[PDB]
Amino acid sequence: SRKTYTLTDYLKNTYRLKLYSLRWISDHEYLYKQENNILVFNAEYGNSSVFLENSTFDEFGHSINDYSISPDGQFILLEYNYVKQWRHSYTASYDIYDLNKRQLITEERIPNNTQWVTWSPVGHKLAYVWNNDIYVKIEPNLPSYRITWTGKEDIIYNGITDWVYEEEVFSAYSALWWSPNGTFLAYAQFNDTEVPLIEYSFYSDESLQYPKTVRVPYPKAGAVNPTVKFFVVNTDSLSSVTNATSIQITAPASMLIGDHYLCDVTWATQERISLQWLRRIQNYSVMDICDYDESSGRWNCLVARQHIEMSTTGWVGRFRPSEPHFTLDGNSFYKIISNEEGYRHICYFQIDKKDCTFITKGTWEVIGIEALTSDYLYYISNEYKGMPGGRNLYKIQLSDYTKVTCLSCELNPERCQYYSVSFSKEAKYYQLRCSGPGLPLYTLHSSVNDKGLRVLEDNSALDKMLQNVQMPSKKLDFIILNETKFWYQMILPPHFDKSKKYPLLLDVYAGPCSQKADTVFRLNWATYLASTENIIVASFDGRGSGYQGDKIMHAINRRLGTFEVEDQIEAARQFSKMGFVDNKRIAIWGWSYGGYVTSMVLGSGSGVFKCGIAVAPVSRWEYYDSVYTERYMGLPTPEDNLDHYRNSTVMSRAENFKQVEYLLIHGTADDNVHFQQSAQISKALVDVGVDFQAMWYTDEDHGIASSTAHQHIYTHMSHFIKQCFSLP
Amino acid sequence: SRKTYTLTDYLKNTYRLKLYSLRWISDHEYLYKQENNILVFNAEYGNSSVFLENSTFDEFGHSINDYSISPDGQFILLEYNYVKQWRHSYTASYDIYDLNKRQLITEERIPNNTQWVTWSPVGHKLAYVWNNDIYVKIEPNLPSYRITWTGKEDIIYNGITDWVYEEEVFSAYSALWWSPNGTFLAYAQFNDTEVPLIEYSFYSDESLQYPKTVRVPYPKAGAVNPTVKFFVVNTDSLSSVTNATSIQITAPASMLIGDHYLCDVTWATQERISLQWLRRIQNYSVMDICDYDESSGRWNCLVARQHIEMSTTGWVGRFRPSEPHFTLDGNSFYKIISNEEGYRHICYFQIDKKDCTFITKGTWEVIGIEALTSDYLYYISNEYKGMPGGRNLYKIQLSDYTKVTCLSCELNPERCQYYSVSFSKEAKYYQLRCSGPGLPLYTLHSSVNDKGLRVLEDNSALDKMLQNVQMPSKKLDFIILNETKFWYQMILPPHFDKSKKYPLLLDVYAGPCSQKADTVFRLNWATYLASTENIIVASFDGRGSGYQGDKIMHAINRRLGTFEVEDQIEAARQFSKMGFVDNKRIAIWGWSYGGYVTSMVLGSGSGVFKCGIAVAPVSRWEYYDSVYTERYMGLPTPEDNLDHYRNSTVMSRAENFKQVEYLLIHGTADDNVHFQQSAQISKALVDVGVDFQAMWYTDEDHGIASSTAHQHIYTHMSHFIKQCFSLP
Ligand SMILES: N[C@@H](CCNC(=O)c1ccc(-c2cccc(C(F)(F)F)c2)cc1)Cc1cc(F)c(F)cc1F
Ligand SMILES: N[C@@H](CCNC(=O)c1ccc(-c2cccc(C(F)(F)F)c2)cc1)Cc1cc(F)c(F)cc1F
C-alpha cells in the first residue's frame, strides 16, 4: 500500500468508525435513528419500520440537539439550545410533543435555561430543575408544582450536583431519582455557602472589551467542602396549592460526627431506597436502607440493615463504592466489593445479614453488574485468558453459583476481546458492543437462546478503506517486575523490523485505577505517529493501575507522585532492553493526570528521556479538588499527610529539567486543572533558568476540545516530536 | 581581540556603565553617595567632605530603600519597606531623623503603607498620602492634621493619581504641589466611581492555594473615565481642632461642557498657580492662572488671562501640553508650543496677552526648558548638525533673543552628542550628562564662566575592558523617502564587511513621538547579537516619530496601525537595497507598542520578513487605555473613528501569519497591556490554523523585569532568533 495514516487523516477524520446507538423502550422494542428517521426495530420478529419520519420537524423552527421519548410511548421531549457547562452539566431549552395527537404543546412550557429534565421511569411525569429548584409536572400542560424554594446560584443546588459532585462522585449534573413507580422524587441538596471560589479569566469574542471573570465553587485539597442533605417527596399527593413536604432522610450517626459525602442512591422497591455515605477520609463507607412508613409519612433506616464498606490498604471503591442490584422483592442485593485477597468480585447480601457471600472468586475482577433476572445475573469481567486488558459478558445461574457461562469469549476470539452490553427491559434481549482488537462489531442477541440473531454493524466499510492504508499493528503483552506481571501495549509501525532501532514515544496516564493497555481498537494520534513517522508509541500499567486487584491499585495509596512515576521510567528501560528502541530517542507525553506524571518523570533526572509534552498537568496536589485528591492523599496537614503532599510537586523538580526538552500546554479556562497549576511550573522553571516551550489556549478547558484548537494542539505537538526526534 | 560581548555579558552585567547621581540642596552644594557615605561636594571651592558617615545606620534595623533630606538641612526622611505598585507608584514605610540633634524620632510617626510623602520645598513640613487621604505635618513630631476625609480605595484618590493618570498624564503617583513658600498644598481628587475594572489572576508563591484576582480601575478606549476636582489648602493657618477648608478651583467653562482631564499644575508665585486642562478629545487645551484673594480666601482665575492651546493637524503636546516657566515676578512665562510651521519651539507669553512671541525658530525642536535666570533661559535641543538624534544644552539671552550660545556642542564632538543637564538652585552651577555616542561622560560647570571645572565620571574603567572586546559599531544615517529625511540606526557587527551579506534584525518601537535612532551609547541585547552572532540590528524612525515636527509626528493621527507599520516594512526594503543584507533572513521584533507594530508587519504579508517576536503587544486599540488610545484615535464610535479602530487589529491579519514564524510573549500580570491583548491574537491564529510559538510569564508585568524572567526571556528570544537564522 502506497498511502499512510496521516496527521490530516486523524484531524479531519478521514476514516470513520461506525457505531450502532440503540435505545430500548420495551422488553423487545428499541430505537435506531437514520438520516433523521427514528425507526423502531422489533427484535422479536424483525417487522420493524417507521416510528417518526425524518421530516416531522423540518418546520420545528430550531436545530434539535437531543430527544427523550416518555417510557409510556406517549410523548417526545425536544432538547434544543444546548450550552455546555462542565463535563456533564449544561443548560438547554425544551418543547414537548404529543405523539398520540400529532401536535406540539404551547401551554405551560418548560422554561429556557433548564438545568436538568427527566421522565418518570414509567408513565409521563416530568421532573425538571431550573434556577436550582426542582419542579414537577404530572401532565405535559398542567402547571408545575414547585418542590424546592431554596435554590440560590452557586450556593444552593436542589436536584443537581455542584462542580465537585458532578465531576468526582456522580458523573452527572443530576441529583434526582425516581422510584421505579413514579411516586417518589428523591433528590439531594448541596450547600456551597463556605466553599471557596476558583477565579479565572474568560476572554470571549474579540468584541468583548473587558474580560469576564468566572467564579466557581471549587474545594481544593483540605478546603471547606460542600455539605449535603437528602430528601424524598411524593409526586401523586401534590396539591396545586400547598408547598410540598419533602421528607429529609438524615445520614447515619457514624457519618454526622464529621465531614462526609453522599456517594450513591439506588432504589430497591416502590417504597425502599438505598444510600451509601462516605467519610471525608474515604476508607470508610456505610449503606442505609430506608422504608416508607405508610401510616407515618416518615422514612425509617433500620440500624440493623446497614452495611459497612471499608479498606485498611486503601480507599473504598474504584473511584466510589459500587452500586447495589436488588432482586424483585427487594430483600437482598448483589454488589461488587473487594474480597479478602483484594479482588473486586460480586458479593451477595441479605438486607439484614452483616456478611455477604462471594458468588465469584479468583485472580481477576468483575467490571460491572449489568442485569439481574429471576434466573441469572449478568456481568462483565476481565477473566478470559488471564487478560485484564479484556472485557467479556458472563452469566451466572442464581439457583447455582458454579454455572458460569461466558456469552462472548468465543464469538470472534481474533476480532473481539473487549465487549460491553446493552440489555432490553426484563433483560429479554441484548446488544454486544465489541471494541477491539479488530474493528468495532455491533451484534444483537436473545437471552433465552443465546443465539446471535442479527449483525447490526460490522464496519466492513471502514475495513475496505483500511486495506489500502499501511496500518500500525498492536502488541499487548506483560513483563514481570517482582513476582508481579505488568501489562503494556505497543503500537508498532507498519512492517515492523525487530532488528532496527525505532524511536519510542511513551504515552502516559498512570492515574489511580488507570488502564492504558487494553485490547481496544483506536484511531488516534498514536496511529498517525506509528504509521507515518515510524514511532513506536508505548503505554504501561504500573502500580496504582486498576482491574488487577487492590495490591497493585492501592500500592500508590498516600504516595501519589511516586511508584506510578517510577514504574513509568522503569518501563522505558525495559523497552530499550528489547532490541528495537533507539535509546537516544525516548520521549514521554500525557494529559491531565498523565501530564503530571510526564512532568515528574522529566524532573526525575533519570536521563532516560530526551523530550516530553505535558498537557493540562497537575503540578501540586494542593491545587486539585478535595474529593479526588484526598481520596489518595488524605489531608494536607502535618498531623495527616502534608509531607508526601509537599514532596510530590513538579516545581520542586525544576532544576532537573535542565536535562530535557519540555513542552507545556494549558487551556486558559480550564475549570478543572486550573491554569494555575501550569503557571506555577512555568514560574519554577523560570526561577531556575531552565528553557522550555509553552503554549496556552485561550478560553479552552481541560479538553482543549474545540475543533480549531484540537487541530492546533495536535499539530503543534507533532512538530515538537518530529523536531525532537529529527524527522524530515 | 579574542573575546566577544556575549549573552551572559548582557544578562549578568559583565560591563557596568558608571553614572554620577547628584542632588543639589543649595545654589552651590550638592550630594554624592559613596560606599553608603553621603558626602556634600562644594562646587565653589572643592573643600567637600562628610555629611553623613556610612555607618550612621548600621544599627537602624531595616534595609534602607531611599532617603530625603529636608531643604532646610535639618532632617532626613528614611524610606524603607518598598513595595511596587504600577510604573511609578508604590507603598512604603518611613522614619524621620533629626540631623541637628543626632536622634531618630519616635513619636507621632509616619504610618506604614504610605502612598506618598514629600518635604515642603523650603522649610521642613511634610505632606503625606495614606489611605487616599492627605495629611500635613508642620513639625516631625507634632500630630498630623487630616486635610481630606473622602479617600476610598480604588474610588477616591486624594493627592495621588489613579492608574490612568499615573501612566498617561503625570508620570507620578503624586498629585501634590507645594507653593514655593510652603503655604499652600495644591492637590487633585480623582473619582473612579464608574470606571470599569480590569480583572486578572495573580498566582503568587507556590503556597497560595487559590490564585488571587487583581482588580484595577482602568478605562479602555471610550469607557467611562475618572473625573477630577482640584483644591488648594493653607498649611500655616491650620487649627489642630477644625477640619481644614480646601478651596476648590473649578475648571473653565469650555471644559465643563464635557469630558476633560487635568493635564498640568505649575505654580507661578507664592499666590499664583497655573493649571492646564485638556478635553477628552485632546486637540483642545486651556490654561488657567489663578490668584489668591487675600481678603476673600477664594481663588480667582481671570478669564482674560487664559491661554488656549490647540491643534488642527493633531493632538496638543508631545504626549501632553508642556509645562510653563515663570519669571521671578510671575507676570510672564515661557513654554514650548508648536509653531506655525509645526516645530516645537519656545514661545514667550505675558499673563494677559493672547499672542506669545517665538524666541526660537527653525527646522528642529526644543526638547525642554531647563532653567530660567534674570539673564538667561537654558534649553535642550536637537538643532546641532541638523540631527534630531542629538541632544544639546543651549543658552539664550533674555535681554536679546539672537544671543544663542551652545554650551555643549563643542566640548567633545566625537564622544558627546547626547547631553542632558542638572542645574543648581538659582542656576549657579550645572552638571552635563553626556550619553553617547561615546561612553557616558559626567562633568561639572559654572554658569557665570561656562568653564569646565571638574570631570566627575569618565567611565575610562569601562573603556579599559572594552578594548579587550570586539565591540559593534553604530552607523546613524538618513534615507530620503519623499522630500522627507527619515533617520535610521544600525548596530554593525565587529569588522563589518560591506560586500558580505549579513542577516538583519529590525528592532521596532514606532509609536507616536517615538525615537529609536539616536546618538546614545547602549549595552543591550542588540550588542550581543551584532558582536557575537553577526547580526545587523536596525531601527528606523518613520512617520508618527517625534522631534522632527508635527508633519512627521501627526502623520499618524487617527490612523494608528498604518503609515508607521508601512514605513517599517519600507525601511527593511531599503536596507536590502544596500548590499550587506541577506534578504532571505530579515527578522522583526518589538515590545509594547513595538510588539504591535511587529505583529502588524508580520500580518502584512509583505513576505519581506521571515520571523518575528512580539513582546507584550497591543492587538486591538479598544483594549488599551482611553487617555493614550484616544489621543491618537479619538472615540471608538461610528460617528467618530470606530472604523480605523476596527480596521487596525492584529487579529484581522491572522491569515497572513501562515507566511511567517512567530513568537508571542506576554507577562500574565500585565496591568498595562493586559494579557487579554495577546490572548486574543493567539485565539485568532488558532482559528485560522496558523502555527506559532508562545511563551507566557507567570506574575509578570509589562516590564518582564524580574531578574530571573528578564534573563529567561532574552535567552528564549536569542534561541528563537538563532534558530530562525540558522546559527550554530
Ligand atoms: N476528575 C477525575 C475524575 C475521576 N472519576 C472518574 O473517572 C469516575 C468514573 C466513574 C464513576 C462512577 C460513576 C457512577 C457509578 C460508579 C460506580 F459504579 F459506583 F463505580 C462510578 C466515578 C468517578 C479525573 C481527573 C484526574 C486528574 F488527576 C486530573 F488531573 C484531572 C481529572 F479529570
Ligand atoms: N503609556 C505610554 C506612555 C509613554 N510616555 C508618555 O505618555 C509620557 C507622558 C507624559 C510625559 C510627561 C510628563 C510630565 C510632563 C510632561 C511635559 F509637560 F510635557 F513636559 C510630559 C512624558 C511621557 C507607553 C505605552 C504605549 C503603548 F502603546 C503601550 F501598548 C504600552 C505603553 F506603556
Side-chain angles (χ1 to χ4, degrees), chain B residues 87 167-171 263-264 318-323 509 592-593 616-618 621 624-625 628 631-632 672-673 702:
Chain B
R87 191 195 293 272
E167 171 79 5
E168 296 309 340
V169 166
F170 285 114
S171 300
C263 83
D264 180 75
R318 296 212 160 100
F319 291 90
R320 77 170 163 125
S322 69
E323 80 287 84
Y509 193 68
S592 198
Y593 200 104
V618 163
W621 289 106
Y624 207 45
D625 72 59
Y628 186 85
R631 216 207 299 300
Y632 317 99
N672 187 335
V673 178
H702 197 52

Side-chain angles (χ1 to χ4, degrees), chain A residues 197 199 204 206 209-210 213 215 218 220-221 622-623 679 682-683 686 690-692 694 696 698 712 716, chain B residues 199 204 206 208-210 213 215 218 220-221 622-623 679-680 682-683 686 690-692 694 696 698 712 716:
Chain A
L197 301 180
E199 297 184 318
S204 203
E206 178 163 337
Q209 194 190 19
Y210 293 70
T213 300
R215 275 164 267 254
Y218 182 110
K220 300 166 167 274
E622 292 138 286
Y623 295 153
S682 55
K683 184 165 62 130
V686 157
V690 183
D691 207 28
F692 60 106
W696 72 90
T698 315
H712 198 119
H716 199 76
Chain B
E199 304 179 313
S204 212
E206 181 159 342
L208 186 55
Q209 196 188 19
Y210 297 66
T213 299
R215 281 161 265 251
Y218 181 112
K220 297 169 171 270
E622 294 137 283
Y623 298 152
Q680 282 295 16
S682 55
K683 193 163 65 123
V686 153
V690 189
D691 209 28
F692 59 104
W696 71 85
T698 312
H712 196 119
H716 201 77

Side-chain angles (χ1 to χ4, degrees), chain A residues 482-703:
Chain A
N482 278 345
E483 275 86 69
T484 327
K485 328 179 46 175
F486 292 115
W487 289 84
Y488 68 96
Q489 71 165 47
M490 302 193 281
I491 307 262
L492 294 174
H495 316 300
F496 169 67
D497 183 350
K498 61 188 205 170
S499 66
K500 291 198 154 202
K501 301 288 186 177
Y502 296 87
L504 170 153
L505 177 49
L506 185 39
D507 164 324
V508 184
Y509 193 69
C513 210
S514 96
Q515 179 154 87
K516 269 292 206 189
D518 56 42
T519 69
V520 183
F521 183 70
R522 312 208 136 83
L523 299 164
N524 45 37
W525 196 41
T527 309
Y528 147 76
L529 287 176
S531 156
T532 292
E533 302 279 351
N534 292 100
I535 311 181
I536 298 168
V537 181
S539 272
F540 170 78
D541 293 319
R543 289 166 276 191
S545 49
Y547 308 124
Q548 307 153 69
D550 289 13
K551 219 133 160 194
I552 285 98
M553 198 182 68
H554 302 160
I556 217 59
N557 188 303
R558 297 177 113 251
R559 297 180 99 271
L560 294 193
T562 64
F563 296 144
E564 80 273 50
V565 188
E566 282 138 32
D567 287 8
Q568 280 318 299
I569 307 164
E570 191 47 54
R573 295 171 183 298
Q574 302 269 310
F575 303 125
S576 51
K577 273 178 210 200
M578 313 175 173
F580 33 105
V581 183
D582 176 353
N583 56 51
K584 290 175 211 74
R585 277 194 311 178
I586 310 150
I588 192 146
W589 103 279
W591 202 300
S592 198
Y593 199 100
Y596 172 55
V597 188
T598 293
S599 290
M600 292 288 270
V601 152
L602 288 161
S604 94
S606 75
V608 187
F609 307 82
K610 184 173 203 274
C611 46
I613 306 166
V615 183
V618 157
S619 60
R620 188 169 199 247
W621 285 110
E622 292 138 286
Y623 295 153
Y624 204 48
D625 70 60
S626 56
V627 198
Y628 189 85
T629 318
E630 284 169 29
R631 214 208 301 298
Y632 313 105
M633 293 301 262
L635 307 184
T637 65
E639 63 278 34
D640 204 336
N641 203 8
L642 194 30
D643 259 6
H644 293 61
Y645 259 93
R646 212 135 283 190
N647 230 311
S648 84
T649 79
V650 170
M651 280 81 65
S652 96
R653 302 184 166 202
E655 185 64 77
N656 300 312
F657 272 78
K658 216 140 180 186
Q659 297 169 237
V660 293
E661 294 164 75
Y662 190 38
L663 176 69
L664 188 49
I665 302 143
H666 217 94
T668 81
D670 203 319
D671 58 283
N672 191 328
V673 177
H674 310 125
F675 188 76
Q676 189 211 12
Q677 313 223 27
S678 279
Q680 280 299 6
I681 295 182
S682 55
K683 184 165 62 130
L685 310 183
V686 157
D687 281 352
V688 185
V690 183
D691 207 28
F692 60 106
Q693 310 288 317
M695 184 52 71
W696 72 90
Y697 283 107
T698 315
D699 296 352
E700 286 284 330
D701 62 352
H702 195 52

